[PDB]
Amino acid sequence: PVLADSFEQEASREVASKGLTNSETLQVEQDGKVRLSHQVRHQVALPPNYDYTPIAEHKRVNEARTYPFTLDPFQDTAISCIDRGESVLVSAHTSAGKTVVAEYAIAQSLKNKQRVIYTSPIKALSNQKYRELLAEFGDVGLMTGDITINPDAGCLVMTTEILRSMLYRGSEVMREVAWVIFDEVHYMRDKERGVVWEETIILLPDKVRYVFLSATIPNAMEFAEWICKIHSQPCHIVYTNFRPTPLQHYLFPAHGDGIYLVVDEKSTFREENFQKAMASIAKGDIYKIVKMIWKKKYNPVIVFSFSKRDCEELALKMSKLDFNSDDEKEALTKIFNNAIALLPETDRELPQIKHILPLLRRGIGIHHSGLLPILKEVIEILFQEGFLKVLFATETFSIGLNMPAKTVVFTSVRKWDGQQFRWVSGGEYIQMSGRAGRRGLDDRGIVIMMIDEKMEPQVAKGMVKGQADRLDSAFHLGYNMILNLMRVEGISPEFMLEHSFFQFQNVISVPVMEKKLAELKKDFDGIEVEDEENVKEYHEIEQAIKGYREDVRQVVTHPANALSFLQPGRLVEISVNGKDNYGWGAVVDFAKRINKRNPSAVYTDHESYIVNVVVNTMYIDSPVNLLKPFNPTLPEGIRPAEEGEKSICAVIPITLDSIKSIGNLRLYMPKDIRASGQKETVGKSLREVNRRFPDGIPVLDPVKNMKIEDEDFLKLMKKIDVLNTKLSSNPLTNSMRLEELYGKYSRKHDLHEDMKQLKRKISEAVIQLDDLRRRKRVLRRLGFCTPNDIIELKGRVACEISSGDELLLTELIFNGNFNELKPEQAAALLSCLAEPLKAMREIAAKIAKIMKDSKIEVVEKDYVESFRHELMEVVYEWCRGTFTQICKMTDVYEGSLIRMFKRLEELVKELDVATINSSLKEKMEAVLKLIHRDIVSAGSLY
């Protein structure tokens, strides 16, 4: 395919505000308004020799849909693609200003008595768009699993999954369908729902036209080419950095009194205001800012926290304040109780609505991942109406609601993940902050970023003036899809892979690699070194030496030997993960690693113990306030200081792989921790000891000190002497150029091994094929036949898609006909004293030996513990019947229930797809009755 018709256009709007500062933010226009611009870029991907007319030159004859306001060029061009009948992709921020474009496509379809599909990811947003489209268009139709009404329609709204099935099933409506409109296309990078999007598209007919709707996305021109490649047709892209109601961006430093406009409505980076801000460098800070905003009247606020545990402590500490808005509570309680009575009664009690309602009263709440879907949409409507003024809410919203604005306040600048404490990304920042600002209802949206760490200009420039995450494919070959590939005709797995966006992105990367591997092949074949033959043998010998003593380190540093040493004060040589030398330090303590985020986790012998060390070589700006206990993942920003930087004393966690050597020395370690100078004094002792051994600290001899006398060990040391001989005995007896000719050849060798690894990434769809090949090799040993056609067992999967592992579950059926009180062991596969949990584990490892036999991933415990015993006895007791009792048996939020209830249940119950093991199909309808009625009519529409 071919790229053409590229152009940028400028556009500018008018709004004036001083906001949260002392001065007016922008140089003012006479009206009291402010002239602000935004750019809007377009290009098209065209098929070879396609007769194209430049979209700028186009004139629409017949306005399908007509609009009251002046359209924007980001809109106006998309609409001319649609009217040229040329697929178009639009990314802009969720002003949902995109809607204008969709509305046009629809109306254009129905004007032509054609049919057109509108897909969103989620059943709910299907209803919301449905109601919206219904009110404007009439013959609209809704297809969820949940709801399905007037399908004999011309405008059909369906979940993305619906469509997937329909393309796989009878391409039925499809025949009359002109345009398919994908909302929230950026969801395709999701590791989960992200394959649905890709698959679906891939399936679709080269003859249907597309309208893609995205949030802003860096490279989307890679997306259109793909469409232009696989549905052989023109695809336009339409991007804008437009912001519906401009944003302002403050840092609130944590000593906490002054507040600094850091990025403007341009976005001009207020560099000076910033460096002022960093200079003025944590519970109560938040209250100060909470009160401040209700007082400064930037009225409703989402206070983003990254954990559930934070949103709950911080929403209640502001439940002291706005217990007012209570002449408003003289109205609130009523639509809030439009609910609790709609409940089952026993499931209407409990610490559920308890608490909550003062916060409701006090114009406040929290935001789940733990509440109830109605508990949260009452809130969402409480937020819609602004009855709640501060919701202490979490990163993650229902994918994705509509939310009140004016005020967005990050409680932080960092995110955990077990545990990197890492900076918010460019991407994360745009989404979360994207919530501040309301159309018309706000002359500006406000972003306030509680910072608490010295942070470089280019770091924050990346975070506050960054871009959104790449759309990168999330495709991969799952079984219950391979089968469906196999069965229905015309459509090979091998056709899917070659057609995936994934293999596409990979296809583009290859000329990229080539240009550099060809750029590196000029440079390795550019460095020529004298007596290369003589240098080499010398270079290799020194490297063989390098490699053996590494083997030695691995022994010493091993927990069988090391641990018996290493008392507080032990001197240790730190090179963490091999790249961060922090030199000598002293042991504070150590501990068996306790991986809490993952129960069934396995660690190396070296990675299995965590060591605390005082080092004094720590870069001074390292946010050492961030590293957590016995968690040797050192946050980005925590580095050792290099030649000519300032240092400090810190206590860091390491693994035994971070240890370069154990000294034969112990200094004094205060058991009084790092308490008020205690770690600094040790810092002075390290300074002393490091000054007392400039050359180095005497290392413990493995043999004379550590009683290490393995036969295997000694032979290693012997090899070392053997080399050290041949090496010394080399005619680079101080060759006067030894450091010059080594350096010259080492660069040659470094570039050589690097040209190898880019020679490998290069040349290799041919990557995805193996899992395909290997999944069939697994599959044939089971349910598909050996010529790769679907047999019986591949009926006991292929139709599923909601598989809690479709193959361990298909295999337990044709084997284990249990009782009634014990088969709640589906908790073991769908949640992520008398036990039949060995029947799945004896069956798994065999299945997992196959997955090992067909050369896929791993059997060993990780496949066997892939199916979790953790909450196996909890969901087990629920099979015997209170809602309030079961919640006393462990520690999982009451929102984990309506998911896993509908996730352990929806696993047991879609077995639609036409009959039979009798004893199953009956004792299991019972299995479905003993849990549904305990929280009966799930029921949740709006």
Residue numbers in the entry: 79 to 93, 95 to 360, 390 to 872, 875 to 942, 959 to 1007, 1009 to 1038, 1040 to 1042, 1044 to 1045, ...
The article reads:
The eukaryotic exosome, which contains both endonuclease and 3′-5′’ exonuclease activities, plays a critical role in a wide variety of RNA processing and degradation pathways. Regulation of this activity involves multiple protein cofactors including the Ski2-like RNA helicases Mtr4 (nucleus) and Ski2 (cytosol). The helicase activity of Mtr4 is proposed to resolve secondary structures and remove proteins associated with the RNA, thus facilitating delivery of single-stranded RNA (ssRNA) to the exosome. Although each helicase exhibits unique features and accessory domains, they all contain a common core structure composed of two RecA domains (domains 1 and 2 in Mtr4), a winged helix domain (domain 3 in Mtr4) and a 7-8 helix bundle domain (ratchet domain or domain 4 in Mtr4).
Recent crystal structures of Mtr4, including apo and RNA-bound forms, and several related Ski2-like and DEAH/RHA-box helicase structures provide insight into the general features employed by these helicases to bind and translocate along nucleic acid substrates. For example, conformational changes are observed between the apo- and RNA-bound forms of Mtr4, including the ratchet helix. Even larger differences are observed in the ratchet helix between the Mtr4 RNA-bound structure and the Hel308 DNA-bound structure, with the Mtr4 apo structure occupying an intermediate position. These conformational differences may arise from the fact that the Mtr4-RNA structure only includes a 5 nucleotide poly(A) sequence while Hel308 is bound to a partially unwound DNA duplex with a single-strand that extends past the ratchet helix and exits through the base of the structure. One potential implication is that recognition of a 3′ poly(A) tail and movement along an RNA substrate involve different conformational states. The primary base interactions in Mtr4 are with E947 (located on a loop above the ratchet helix) R1026, R1030 and E1033, occupying one face of the ratchet helix. The direct protein-nucleotide base interactions observed in the Mtr4 crystal structure suggest that the function of the ratchet helix may not be restricted to RNA translocation (by analogy to Hel308), but may also involve RNA sequence recognition.
